[PDB]
Amino acid sequence: DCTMYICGDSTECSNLLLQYGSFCTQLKRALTGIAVEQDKNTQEVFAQV
């Protein structure tokens, strides 16, 4: 979670972070993609029968 990690509970920190753009969209997208990739690997490996 970008907010919790970078800023935490600081609302002014969150306001400053919102100026940086869409870095966190890419971060979360890559993390979810890695998760789905690991799941697909497990499936392709163990669900061949």
Binding site: D1, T3, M4, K28, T32
Partner: protein, 48 residues
């Protein structure tokens, strides 16, 4: 909210992460030692 996150008016079948849930604090507490080391302010001001 899923629409607003995906930036699209249509959503396909699946599971989508949209926001974060966190319990907000209820009240604030402040703690300090037993601060009782007072100076002779009164003893000096009320002196004869």
């Amino acid at each position: 909210e899923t629409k607003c996150t995906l930036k699209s008016f249509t959503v396909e079948k699946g599971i989508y992460q949209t926001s974060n849930f966190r319990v907000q604090p209820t009240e604030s507490i402040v703690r300090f030692p037993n601060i009782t080391n007072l100076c002779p302010f009164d003893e000096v001001f009320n002196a004869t």
